[model samples]
Target: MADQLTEDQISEFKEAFSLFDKDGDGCITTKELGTVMRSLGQNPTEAELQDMINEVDADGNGTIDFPEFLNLMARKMKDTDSEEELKEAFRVFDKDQNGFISAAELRHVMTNLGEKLTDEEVDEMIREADVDGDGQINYDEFVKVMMA
Candidate 1:
């Protein structure tokens, strides 16, 4: 989302990174990443995920640290397919096509995603990601949420 992302982005990225860093040692192994992928409904093979880590495991220790995680996503972000998919997914959610997701639309979306959240939680989610104080999410902020 940036040549170098902001502090908030770094923190958010770590929140996601920690999800797969099961041992809480600030690194993620292929096994943990695969488990997370499965949580998202993916069924990637060990070999496939291993290849991913092989590309980003800078330490060659068969684990991915936060910086390495950033590298992997940065590489992936450059893919035409990843870019197009991002645009399309954002398009689907940005029904107003105003280049922002307002609070109302966000709540409406939670139901569709089957993600249960109270109104307050929804507001907090938006607030946490709305870096511009626009009370809405623009593409950049949305990417942070989507990626995380």
Candidate 2:
């Protein structure tokens, strides 16, 4: 899902990342992020800053790189009014109350998207996302693919 972000959004994320990363290093340290947070007129304790770092620093490197920051910001920018809206979208794809989207459903949906994928391509996509070795993509699988 993130792979399909618009160029403008990615550029904005790059700008935000550069701003937070004042030193222009490859990563944003705790201090750097704290400075940005304070500049935004919000006061955060050291523990709060560390908590934010812990959430975004995927590699446990004690600092966050552009990709990490961009991914976090992208998730934050999803802008869903409520979780039900997101679930409703998933339900549309599910087509049935089975809580999963089968290959047939994917093929049907593929046509609705800009690039219509063949049945074989849909099956391949399912193979990549079916983490539990199941024949279908369960809710977990759906969230995994979408969240990534």
Candidate 3:
């Protein structure tokens, strides 16, 4: 399969990685992921969280590090759509092709779709969407802001 992430997408992916690396430990423990999820009001059950960790921890290392976490998020994002047409729509909005959407890329695509946004407006949107302050938005963050 062709790599989904573009250069810009990689930048956003790095941002997501930085966010998950909460303790600056260069890795994401289950506790850290739980903390983040709780902060986002996800409040997943312990069993659910464990299931997530088990499914996404590709290395069987009992942790979902940055890369593994990103892959999981990407798959989840892609799964949101049912049909190939809907998937294509999602892909079109995924400008960076990182399998997720960044605030900048979201704004740009929205503009192309005829939604006008000022730079300050976009920055504010980023501030709202970029919970991690890593200067990008992940799938979870994107869905959160958009849904609310």
Best by lDDT: 1
lDDT of 1 by residue, 59-79 (tens): 898889899997776666557
Q: Model 3 — which ten-residue stretch has the worst lDDT?
A: 78-87
Question: lDDT per model, in order?
Answer: 0.83, 0.83, 0.75
User: After superposing candidate 2, which stretches have Cα over 4 Å from the reference?
Assistant: 1-3, 81-148
In model 1, pairs of residues that clash are none
Candidate 2 residue pairs in backbone clash: none
For 1-148, candidate 3 gives per-residue lDDT tens digits of 1348677766787788888778887677778878999999888888887887888888888877778877866766566543444556657878978866666786889899999898888778778878888777666666666557
> Which residue pairs overlap in candidate 3's backbone?
none
What number of clashing residue pairs does each candidate have, in the order they appear? 0, 0, 0
Q: Please report how far candidate 3 places residue 120 from its true position, in Å.
A: 54
Per-residue lDDT of candidate 2, residues 1-148 (tens digit): 4347888888888987888889998799889988998898988999999999999989998999988988887676665433546677778778776898999888876677666897789999999999998789888788787778
Q: What's model 3's overall lDDT? A: 0.75
Question: If scored against the real structure, what TM-score would every candidate get?
Answer: 0.49, 0.51, 0.49
